[PDB]
Amino acid sequence: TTLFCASDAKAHETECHNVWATHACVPTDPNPQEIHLENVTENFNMWKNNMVEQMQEDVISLWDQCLDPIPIHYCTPAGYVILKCNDFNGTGPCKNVSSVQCTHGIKPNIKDNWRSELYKYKVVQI
Amino acid sequence: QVQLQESGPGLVKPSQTLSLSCTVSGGSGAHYWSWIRQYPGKGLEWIGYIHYSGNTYYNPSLKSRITISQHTSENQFSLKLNSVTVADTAVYYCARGTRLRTLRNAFDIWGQGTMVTVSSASTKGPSVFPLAPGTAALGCLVKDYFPEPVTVSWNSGALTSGVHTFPAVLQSSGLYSLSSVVTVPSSSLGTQTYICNVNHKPSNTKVDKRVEPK
Amino acid sequence: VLTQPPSASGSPGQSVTISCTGTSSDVGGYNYVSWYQHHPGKAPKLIISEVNNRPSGVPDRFSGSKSGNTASLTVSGLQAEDEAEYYCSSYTDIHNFVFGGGTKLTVLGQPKAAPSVTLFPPSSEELQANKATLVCLISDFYPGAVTVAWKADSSPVKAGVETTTPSKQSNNKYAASSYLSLTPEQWKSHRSYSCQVTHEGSTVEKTVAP
C-alpha cells in the first residue's frame, strides 16, 4: 500500500530536507504502539519489500525542490500495519514479532542503504 | 465508506460568532481535518485545519478570528468564526486532507457543503416593482424582504409558458431581492392584461402587481 | 488568487484542456497542485493530485500537467457525465493553500446561443419611493457560463452589485441576472449606465440613460 511520513521537523526552518519534511510529513507522535505478538511466527523478506519502493521516490522529490539531517519515519494507514522482527538477517522466519504504526527515526543505490535498516519491517493488510 | 456531514445553525447576526460541526462517518491516521468555504463563483478559500495530533494550522488572513477543535468522542470536529459580517455569508465544506505520498497536500474526501447566512434583518416583506417593455419581455422586481422563500406566478396561475423566476440575491444590507419575467406576443399588450402574484409566507404577505407598458 | 478561464466547451468524444495560472511561490514553487470535480449540491471529487496523479477509480482519460507557473488539466474523450465544474488548488508557504475561481466544463448537447441582454432601468414607483435598481436580464444562451460587469458613464463599478449564477429555462437553455442598486442622485447625475456580459470571448454590452 501507499505510506506516509512523519517527522518532528520544525515548521520554520531552512536546512534543505527539514524544508522538504515540513511540506511532506506530518508531526510525529511521541507515543507509538509496539505490541508483543503472542505465540505466532511470520516470514520476512527485505528483498521483496515495497517500503523500499516509496522511500526511494521521496528522496527524488527531496532533491527536486531541495535548492543537518533529521529523523524521518514511515507509517501505514488504516486497513494495514507494520510487523517488525525483534529476532535475523533480512530473510526467513522470525518468532518475536511486534506490530508498529511507524518505523524508527531514519537519518538519511541508496535504496539498499535503506535496506541496511529496513530489513526488520513488513506490511500486511487486514 | 468514509463520509463527512456538516451540521450547523444557518443564520447568524453580524458581530456574533459562527460555529459548525462536521461528523465523520466511515471510518476512523495522518490526515488533516479541514474547513473550506465557497463564495459561489469567486471563489474558494481554505480556512484552516487541525491534525490528528492536535496541531492547528489556520489561514493567515484570519487575524485571530478563528479556532478549530476535535471531539474524538463522537468522531467529529468543529470550527468557530468570530465577529462575522455579511461578507462571511458562504457555503461551508468540511474535508479530509492527506499527506500520503501521491496525494500530499490535497483533499481526498469532502463534505456535501452546507449554507450559512449572515444577517441582522428580522422578518421583512417585499416591495414589488414592475419591469415594463414581436417578442417583448416584462417582469416584477421583488425587493428587500427576509427571509426566503418567495413565490411568484403570473396571471393567477393561467400564464405559465415563457415564464422564468430567478434565484434570490443577498444584498450587503442583509436583505433579499429577486426578479420574475415572462416573454409575450406584443400583439397583445393593450389587450391582454398581466399580473405577477408575489407570495411571502414569513410575513404572511401576498402582493398582486399589475405590469403594463410605458 | 489562481486564474482559470470561466468556461470550456466540447462535444462528445472531443478533448479539452483547462489552464490554472499561479505564481512562483504557488505553482512552480511546489509540485502540490490538485484538481477537484464538483457536480452541483454534491460533494467534490478529487481527480488529480500532486500535479498529474490519478487516484484509484479515476479513468485514464483525465490528466494533469504544468509547464511554468501554469498547471493544466485535460479530459480526453468527453462523455455527457463529465459536465461539471472544475477547480484547482496549490499548496503554498509553510502550511497554506490557494484556489482558482473555477471553470464550468460544458459538454455540448445542443446548439450554442449568445445571450439576449435586456437591461431594465428603475421603475417610476421605485424612484418616487426614494430607491433605484438597474436589472440586467441575461437570457437564451448556451453554454451556461457568463461574466458580468457594470459601467457608470465610461467607468467600472463593483460596489452595489450582486449577480445570479446561470439557471436552466423551460426550453433547456440558460438564464441569469445581475443587479445594480444605487440612489437617485447617482442614477440621474451620470449620463449613462452600461451592463456588459461576457460569454465565450464575445462581450455584449447594453446601455441605458436617464
Residue numbers in the entry:
A (entry chain G): 50 to 116, 211 to 230, 233 to 253, 474 to 491
B (entry chain H): 1 to 28, 32 to 35, 35A, 35B, 36 to 82, 82A, 82B, 82C, ...
C (entry chain L): 4 to 27, 27A, 27B, 27C, 28 to 95, 95A, 96 to 106, 106A, ...
Article excerpt on this structure:
Here, we describe the first successful attempt at isolating the inner domain (ID) of gp120 as an independent molecule that encapsulates the A32-like region within a minimal structural unit of the HIV-1 Env.
This revised second independent ID molecule, with the V1V2 stem removed and stabilized by a C65-C115 disulfide bond, was designated ID2. ID2 fully preserves the fold of the ID of the gp120 coree in its CD4-bound conformation with the seven-stranded β sandwich and all the secondary structural elements of layers 1 and 2 (including α0 and α1 helices) present and arranged to form the C1-C2 epitope as seen in complexes of A32-like mAbs with CD4-triggered gp120 corese (Acharya et al., 2014). Most of the ID2 molecule is defined in the complex (85% of the molecule, compared with 61% for ID1) with the only unresolved regions mapping to the N and C termini (residues 42–44 and 492) and to the introduced flexible -GGA- and -GG- linkers (residues 117–118, 206–209, 254–256, and 472–474). Each of the four disulfide bonds (including the newly introduced C65-C115 disulfide bond) are defined and maintained as predicted. The A32 Fab-ID2 complex also represents the first co-crystal structure of mAb A32 with its cognate gp120 antigen. mAb A32, similar to A32-like mAbs N5-i5, JR4, and N60-i3 described previously in complexes with gp120 corese, binds exclusively within the C1-C2 regions of gp120. Its epitope is formed by bridging mobile layers 1 and 2 with anchoring points centered on the β2¯ strand, the α0 helix, and β1¯ strand, and the α1 helix (residues 51–54, 60–61, 69, and 71–78 [layer 1] and 103, 106–107, 110, 113–114, 217, and 220–221 [layer 2]). The interactive surface that becomes buried at the Fab A32-ID2 interface is 1,701 Å2 (856 Å2 contributed by Fab and 845 Å2 by ID2).
